[PDB]
Amino acid sequence: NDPAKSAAPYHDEFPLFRSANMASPDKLSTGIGFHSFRIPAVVRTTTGRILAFAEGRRHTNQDFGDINLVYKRTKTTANNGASPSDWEPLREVVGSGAGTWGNPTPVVDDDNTIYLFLSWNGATYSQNGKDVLPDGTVTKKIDSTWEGRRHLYLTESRDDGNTWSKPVDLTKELTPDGWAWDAVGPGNGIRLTTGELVIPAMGRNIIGRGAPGNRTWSVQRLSGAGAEGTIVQTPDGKLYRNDRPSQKGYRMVARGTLEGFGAFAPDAGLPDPACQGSVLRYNSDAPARTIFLNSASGTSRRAMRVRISYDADAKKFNYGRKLEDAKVSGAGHEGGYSSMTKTGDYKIGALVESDFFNDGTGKNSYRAIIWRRFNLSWILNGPNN
Numbered sequence: 001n002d003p004a005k006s007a008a009p010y011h012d013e014f015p016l017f018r019s020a021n022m023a024s025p026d027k028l029s030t031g032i033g034f035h036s037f038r039i040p041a042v043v044r045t046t047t048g049r050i051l052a053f054a055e056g057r058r059h060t061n062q063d064f065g066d067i068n069l070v071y072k073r074t075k076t077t078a079n080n081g082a083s084p085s086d087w088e089p090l091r092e093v094v095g096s097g098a099g100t101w102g103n104p105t106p107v108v109d110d111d112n113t114i115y116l117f118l119s120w121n122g123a124t125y126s127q128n129g130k131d132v133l134p135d136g137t138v139t140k141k142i143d144s145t146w147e148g149r150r151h152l153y154l155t156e157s158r159d160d161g162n163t164w165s166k167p168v169d170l171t172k173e174l175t176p177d178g179w180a181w182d183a184v185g186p187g188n189g190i191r192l193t194t195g196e197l198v199i200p201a202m203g204r205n206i207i208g209r210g211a212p213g214n215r216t217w218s219v220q221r222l223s224g225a226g227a228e229g230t231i232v233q234t235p236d237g238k239l240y241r242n243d244r245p246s247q248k249g250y251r252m253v254a255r256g257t258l259e260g261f262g263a264f265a266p267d268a269g270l271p272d273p274a275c276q277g278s279v280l281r282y283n284s285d286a287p288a289r290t291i292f293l294n295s296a297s298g299t300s301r302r303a304m305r306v307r308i309s310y311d312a313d314a315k316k317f318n319y320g321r322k323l324e325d326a327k328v329s330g331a332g333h334e335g336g337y338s339s340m341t342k343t344g345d346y347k348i349g350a351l352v353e354s355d356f357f358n359d360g361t362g363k364n365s366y367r368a369i370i371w372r373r374f375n376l377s378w379i380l381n382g383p384n385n
């Protein structure tokens with residue numbers, strides 16, 4: 001079988017975004033703190049530096065209200081984020097206004113420009129409407145007006161994540177007209193063997209063409225796609241969308257190319273409780289591997305499972321390994337949204353939400369984000385394969 005199984009298994013895990021209830025909570029240099037951190041995204045840059053993004057949810061764990069896009073980088077290009085002291089303090093990409101800056105969806109381009117697509121909504125709008133903000137204000141439902149719709153923003157870094165451009169609004173260009181709710185990712189985009197960028201979004205892929213870091217963007221509309229999509233290029237070189245379902249059950253999968261996709265259909269091999277997931281191209285040479293991470297349950301977010309597919313079209317994934325085999329203590333109950341990258345030292349790097357659950361499903365439940373490193377051997381030597 002997989003020759004990587006013969007390596008010494010390795011795993012390494014600790015909280016990277018520490019909620020307000022924890023010792024040494026993560027705050028900006030300006031003193032700004034956050035109740036909860038949610039919605040992770042992680043990329044390794046061409047230098048080997050690792051950039052980890054999240055939504056800094058200022059006041060509660062809710063998806064609406066004042067939410068800033070925060071991040072951490074590894075201190076050097078070479079440390080691979082192996083220990084807590086390897087990581088810089090919390091920084092901010094964008095936090096302007098009392099609205100929502102979220103859905104981090106980064107992609108590293110060939111020139112090392114890091115593109116970060118984001119969603120935005122106004123301070124007084126929420127997905128469902130009639131939600132109560134900290135000051136008692138009742139939100140309006142997100143609608144199709146300019147003020148009340150979800151926007152699509154793009155920021156980039158030319159200095160290995162050190163600084164970020166003021167986000168530009170690309171809603172009119174890259175979001176279909178008449179839309180209200182929208183989402184990009186969250187998680188990551190990809191660079192294809194043939195050179196294009198592909199960013200998964202609600203109902204569509206965003207395609208980047210042309211010179212690295214100077215791309216032209218267009219929209220590839222997808223029939224039957226989900227709101228929260230993932231994208232990978234499979235070993236056969238084709239495209240693969242693996243999306244969160246609208247109802248609990250299974251991941252929704254479609255395959256295609258830049259010239260078009262086939263139908264979405266449930267993947268019976270990948271149970272999902274209606275939650276975001278992540279997918280990663282690990283390598284293309286024998287055995288070629290695609291990695292997948294989600295909560296492997298039709299009902300629960302607390303069943304995080306990392307898996308490998310050796311299939312040229314990622315038809316079938318193995319059982320993989322439960323993340324709870326390498327449990328983190330003192331950071332709540334692991335499970336929820338995730339993001340993965342390959343590290344510079346031949347590991348998979350994963351960000352995974354965790355929930356203290358101190359207020360149950362309520363707004364005051366503190367949310368933190370765990371950073372994991374593990375090798376293929378660790379996945380393959382799991383007891384349930």
Ligand SMILES: O=C(O)[C@]1(F)O[C@@H]([C@H](O)[C@H](O)CO)[C@H](O)[C@@H](O)[C@H]1F
Pocket residue numbers: 308309310311316317318319
């Ligand atoms: O055994 C595996 O690794 C697996 F679970 O089943 C494999 C396949 O069905 C045979 O077990 C090996 O040829 C798939 O190719 C793999 O992607 C995976 F799903």
Ligand SMILES: O=C(O)[C@]1(F)O[C@@H]([C@H](O)[C@H](O)CO)[C@H](O)[C@@H](O)[C@H]1F
Pocket residue numbers: 299300301302333334335336355357360361362
């Ligand atoms: O959905 C779940 O699995 C859960 F039961 O509820 C989640 C959350 O409170 C609800 O999904 C509502 O947002 C927790 O993060 C999970 O740890 C778990 F408790």
Ligand SMILES: *[C@]1(C(=O)O)O[C@@H]([C@H](O)[C@H](O)CO)[C@H](O)[C@@H](O)[C@H]1F
Pocket residue numbers: 039063127183227228274275276
């Ligand atoms: C997420 C969740 O925790 O379930 O849900 C999305 C969104 O509500 C769903 O995809 C349905 O459209 C939020 O945007 C995200 O912030 C998070 F809460």
Ligand SMILES: [Cl-]
Pocket residue numbers: 182183202227228
């Ligand atoms: Cl969504």
Ligand code: NA
Pocket residue numbers: 066067068095096097098099
């Ligand atoms: Na803000």
